[model samples]
Target: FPVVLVINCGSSSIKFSVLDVATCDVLMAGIADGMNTENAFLSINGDKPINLAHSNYEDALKAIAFELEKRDLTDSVALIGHRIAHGGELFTQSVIITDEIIDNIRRVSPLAPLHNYANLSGIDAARHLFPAVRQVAVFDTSFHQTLAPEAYLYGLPWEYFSSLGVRRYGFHGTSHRYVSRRAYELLDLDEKDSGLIVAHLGNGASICAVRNGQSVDTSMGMTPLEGLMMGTRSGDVDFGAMAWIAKETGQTLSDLERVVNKESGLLGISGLSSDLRVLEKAWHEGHERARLAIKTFVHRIARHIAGHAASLHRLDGIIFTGGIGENSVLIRQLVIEHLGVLGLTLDVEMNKQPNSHGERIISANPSQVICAVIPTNEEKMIALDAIHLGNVKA
Candidate 1:
C-alpha cells in the first residue's frame, strides 16, 4: 500500500504506471498498444515486448498485473488512478470511484465517444483485478469546472445548452493544474491572489486563464478541438465556412469531421507533415506554406492568450508547458513576440536554453509579465489526487 498505479486508457491502448507515492517515482511503467488486433503487444519500461494477439483491455491489464506480481510490487499498489478524459458536469474534481461514478461516466460517454467508453473499460478491468485497492477517477476537464457560465456558454439555441448539455468544457485539467501550481512556486506568488495563463502546446493544444488559482476562462470550448491550432486539429474555424465547404464540395458530415479533426491544422495549412519538428525544418529550408502554418499557429496562440487575459483582473505570468511549449524555443519566442501588447518580452538567451535545466523564467526584467517554461506531469498529478483521496485507507 505504498505505491499508486496510474492508468491512462486510450481507445486502443492502456498505459499503466506503478509509482512510489512517497517520492512520486515510477517503480514500473508500460503500455499495451495495438489492442484487439493481431499485432497487439505490451512494452515494459523499454524492455523486451510481450505478444498478445487480438487482446482487449482486460487481457492487457491482466498481463500488466502479471508483470507487477513478478516484480513483487502488486501488494504495494494501494490506490489506482484512472485518467478519464471527460467527466462532463458530474465530476468537478478527482474522486473515489464508486458504482454510481462509473454509471455517471457512462452517462456522459456520448460527449466524448472515442475516449470515455474506453476509459470505462480500463476502470472495469482494474476494479475486477485489484478488488481491494481503492481506485480514483481523475478527469481532464475537472480543473476548468470553475469557469463562469459566461465563459462556458455558446450562442446556440437554449435547448442545445439546457436540454442537450452543450457548453465549453476545457480539457487538460491535470496539466494546467500541475503547471500553474509550479508557476506559483517559481514566481513566489500566493495562490490566494495570483493570475496566470497556461499554454499547453502538445499535438493537441489549449490555453487556460487561472485567476486566484481557479480557471476563469480557457481557449478550448465544449471539445478539445476548439482551441489553439494543433498538430492535426484546425483550432478555431468559422461554422459558416464549414457549412459552406460542405455545400460547395458535397462532402458528407463525416468527411468534414475527419478533415477538421485529422487532416487540418498544420497538415492542411502547410501541405506537409503535422509534426512541428518537421515543419520547423521545412521553414528553415524556406518552405512558404510551412512558414505560413507556423505563423498562423503563433498568431492564434497569442490572440487567445490576450483574449483569456480579459477574464483576469490582473496579469501576473504566462506559463508554457507540454511538448512544444517546453522544447520549441522558436515557437515560444514568436508567441511572446506577438504578445508585446501585453508587455510580455522574452529573454532571448534564456529562451534558447535546453530543457535539460528544467523549469525556468524566460522573461527579461523590463517585461511587465513573466514568461516561464514549466514541464507538465499529468501522471504525477493523478497519482497525487489518488493519494489525497485514498489516504484514509492507506
Candidate 2:
C-alpha cells in the first residue's frame, strides 16, 4: 500500500500522519512535542509517549522512522507532504520540493520567520530520513493568493507595499479550502457559482470569503495575528492606539508586539485563561470579565463574517471549522445570533449537537444562508495534494 507521510512542524512540535493514498484513511498519526525539553516525547496513534528526551528535530524524525520500520510500512511510503505556513507570493499552489523550491521558501521565510524556519527544519530532516521519497510543499497562505488589490493591499505608504511587500496574506488556507470544497458537496451547491464564508476558529482563527471556488478575501492580514480574536492574539488593534500605548509606557515595538501576539485576546480581556472552555465555565458562574470576553469574541467573529460577505456576489453558506468552531455550541450560537442582518437563523436543536456529530447543518429552514460545522482535515488535504502532484495510485 503506497502511503503519504504528512509533516506539520512547529517551533517545538512535529505533528505527522501516514495515510493510505488509495483510501485516505490514516494508517498512523502522532506528534513529537516539547522538543529540546527534558519532557520531550513522541506519541504514536495516541499511545503512551515514548521518551525522546532533549531530542532535536533530526533525532525526533529518526525515531519516527524507526517506528515506521517496526511496522514494516517504511518502503510503502511513496511520497511526503509538508505543511508550510507562509509561502507569500512565491508559491500559489502545492509543488514538488526541489533545491530551488527550498531556496524560494527561504526567500519568503522573513514573512513568517518562526514558522517557515521551523518548517524548513522539518523539510531538511524529512529529506535526510526519506532520501528516496518525493516530498511536496503545501502552503497555508497559497489559497488566499487570489485576493485582488482592493482586498489584499494595506493602506500604508506605497513604498511599504511596493518595496517591502507589506500586504494582507491570509493564513489557514488549507483549512479554508478543505472546508469550503466540502461545503459545496454537503450543501449541494455549484462550485462555480458559490459564495461561502469559512470561519476557522481554533486557537488561531480567521474568516475566509470563498467565491466560485476561489478565496476572494480573508480576515487575516499580512500575518495571523491580524485576524479574529485568537487564543492569545489581539486581533484588529488600531495602529494609532499601539503607538500611543508604546509612547505612554515607554515600551519598545517588540514589547507591544509580544503583548499583541501573546498577552491579549480572550486572556487579556477576561484577565483569566485563554482557553474558551475555562472562560465559558467562568461565564456561567457570572464572571463579568469572562462574559465580556466571550461576547466580544462572538461580536468580532460575526462582524468579520458579514464583512467578508461583501466580497461575494451572494451569500450561499457559512462554514465553521477548527477547534472552537467545531465544538463550541455556545460560541456558534452567539455568533449566528449576531448575524440577523445576514438572515442567518440557527436551528437551536441542530446547533446544540456536539462536535462528535461531525459535519452538519445548523441553520433554520427559513434562513437565507446556509450554516454548517465542517471539521477541517488539513492533513488529508495535504496528502491528496501530494498524491495528485506525484500521480500516485493504490
Candidate 3:
C-alpha cells in the first residue's frame, strides 16, 4: 500500500497523482490542462508552469512518466488506478484492467461517448508506459449500481433499456461514495449503518441519496443532462422543448443537442460566464439575470435534495462536497435555507465558517438534522479500491 498512481482524465485535461496509500499522502499531483490542443500547460507539484505547444494527450502521458522518473517515483509505484466514467452495469466495482475489460469499456462508449474514449486513451497509454505496474479501472457508475430497478428506470420503452442500456447510470459515483463515507465517520456513526444525502457541486454536479451507504437514487440520469442545472448543461428540459427549439431555429436534433449541452444553463441564463463565482460577484453588483441564475441553481438543488430525503428511510445527515459545494459558503446557505421543510436549520455562524481540507460539522446545536462539509477524495478512493481489488479491501 505504499504507492498508487491515480489517473483521472477528462475530455480536456489529465489529472494525476502519486499517493502513499498507507498514509494517504499525495507526494506529487498535477494536471495537464488543454490536452490535445494549444494553450496546453502542465503545473506539477505546485511549481512554475510549463507550456506545451501543438501537443496531445499522448505527449502528456510521456510528460507524466518523465515527472515520475524525474522524482524517482516510478520505482515505488505499485499500481495505477484509473477513473472510468461509465461501467454500463457490467462493472459494479473496481477491477484490474484487462484486454477484455478495455474492450468492455469501449463497448459501452455510446452511453458515455465523450468520457469513455478520453478515459480509454489514458488507460491504454498508462498500461503501456507503466508495464511494471498493474492498472485498475475504478468506475464512477459502479457505486450506484445498487440503485433499485425503480430508481434507475426511465419511463421509456423496455426495448430501449433491455437492448440499448438506457437507464439512469449516474456519474460522480466516486465523489459521492467518498464524501458519504466521510460524512458518517465525521458524525461518529457506523458507515454501513448511516443514511443521508450528498450533493456534489462542481462544473458537473449531482445529488445522491445514500441509504446505508448505498446509492438508492441520484440526480444525473442516463447522461449528465437529466439532473440539476449545471455549468453549461440545460438539465431536465423537456423533449418537446428541445424539438420545438430545433423546429423554430431550423436545425437538427444534433444541433440542438449542442446548444442544450454547451450553450445553456448558467451561461445562457446570465448571458455571462458559467462560473458561479463570477455570477455571484455580478449579483452583488445588482445584476438581475445573475441573481436569477444563482436562485435557480439553488432552487433546483434543494428540490432534488428534498426528493432524495424522501428516498431514505432515515435522515442521518446531509453532506456537501466537490468544488462549489465545498468552497461556496453562500451557496450552502441558500440550499440550507430552502430545506427548512426537510427539518434542516442552519447555524448561520457554522455555515459561514471556513472548512479545513477534511471533514467538519456545520450544523447547529440540536439541529433539526446533521449537516457537514466533507471534502471528497476521489483519488484516495480510487487508490484504495485499486489496492483492495489488486489484493489488499483490508
Candidate 4:
C-alpha cells in the first residue's frame, strides 16, 4: 500500500497528507486557505468549503492534485514528503529531490525569507504535477543538525560565521525531531538516557535542548526570529531595540526586518490577534490585551523553560509540540505557571483532558519535570525520512 504524500508549503497555506505508507495512516488531509486572500479556503478531510476563485502556489498544488485525484489513491504513490523550510547548510538529511536538490533549495532562500520562498513554490509545483513522483526534501533545518558548536555558533563576525552562512540554523527541525523521538518512545527511555525539553509551540516557535537525543541547546538563535513569543515573530528582540528602531523609525534594515518579522508576536503583544485561538477568545471576552497577551505568552514560556532548564541539566521531561503547543489548554496552563520552581507540576486532570494523542503524563504525580503532549508527527517524521532515504521496506 505505498502511499505517503505529506507536502506542507506554508506562506499562505498548502498542506497535503495522504500517508498510509504501510500504515503510517493519515489517509487524507488538506488545506489551501487564503493563498492570495479574498476569502480563499479549500479544506478537505470530510469536505464542504471550496470556493477557490483565485489561488497561487501553482493553484495550491493543483488543488492538492485535484484532491488526490478524488481518493482513487493515486495507485500506491510511493514517496513525496517535501517540507523544506530552509535546508540551508545544504541539508543534513532527507534528500532525493534533485536538479541538485532544487539548486540547494534555491540557495537557501535568503535564510527562510517567508519560508524558503513559499517552500520553493511548493517544490516547483510538486515537480510539475507529479511527473512520476518520488520526491523527498524534508528538512526544517534537518532536526537542528544536532546543534552544539556551542549550540550552533553566532557570536557573529567570524566573517558572518565563516564566510556568510551566518549561523544558529534552528527551526522546527521536523517538530523537534519528532517530539524527541516521541519522547523516547513514550519513556521506555534510553534514547541515550533521554533529557528533552522540546516545546515547539506555533505560528512558528522554537526551544529545544534534547541532550541525549542531541540538540544540546536552542531557543532558536540565528533565525526563526530567535526563540519563543511567536504568531508574528519578534521572539527575542533588543538588538539595541533594533538599533533604536532603526535610529528613531527611519526604518529600513528591510523595514526593521519587516517590522520584527511581520508585525511582532502575539500580534505585537495583543494589540489583538495572532490566534492563540484568537487570543484565547479575547482572553475569555474580557481582553486586557487579551489578558496581557496570555500572560506574556506564559512569561515567555516560563523564561524559555528556565533557560532550557539550565541547559537541560538532566531535564527528563517537557515535550509539548507545535500549533500553540498542540492545541492550547489555556496555553498549557499558562505554560506550567511558574514551573513550580522546576519540579514542574501540571496534572490538573491531565491538563484538562485531550492529551491530543496517546502519550499522556502531564506531570504532577510528585513532579520532577515529566510533562508531555507529544502529538507532533512532522508527517510521520517526513515519512520516516522517506522510508530511510528510499531503502524502502516498511
Worst 10 residues of 4 by lDDT: 353-362
Better of 1 and 4 by TM-score: 1
Clashing pairs in 4: none
lDDT of every predicted structure (CA atoms): 0.93, 0.94, 0.87, 0.79
Clashing residue pairs, backbone N/CA/C < 3 A, model 1: none
Across 90-143, the per-residue lDDT of candidate 3 in tens digits comes to 988888888899999999888998888999999878987888688899988988
Q: How many steric clashes does model 3 contain?
A: 0
At residue 191, give the lDDT of candidate 1. 90
Q: TM-scores of the models, in the given order? A: 0.98, 0.97, 0.95, 0.32
Backbone clash count for every predicted candidate, in the order shown: 0, 0, 0, 0
Ranking of models by TM-score? 1, 2, 3, 4
Report the alpha-carbon TM-score of model 3 versus the true structure. Answer: 0.95
Number of the top TM-score candidate:
1
What does candidate 2's lDDT look like per residue over 1-394, in tens digits?
7999999999999999999999998999999999878889999987888989988989999999999999999999999999999998999999999999999999999999989999999999999999889999999999999999999999889999988989999999999999998999999999999999999999799999999999999999999989698789999998999999998999999999999998999999999989999999999999999999999999999999999999999999999999999999999999999999999889999999998999899999899999999999999999989999896332
Per-residue error for 274 in candidate 2, Å, reads 1.1
Candidate 4 local lDDT, 271-367, one digit each (tens): 8778887778887888888788778878887898778767665888887777677767778777886777877778778877774455666777788
Top lDDT prediction, candidate number: 2
Q: Which ten residues in a row have the lowest lDDT in candidate 1?
A: 385-394
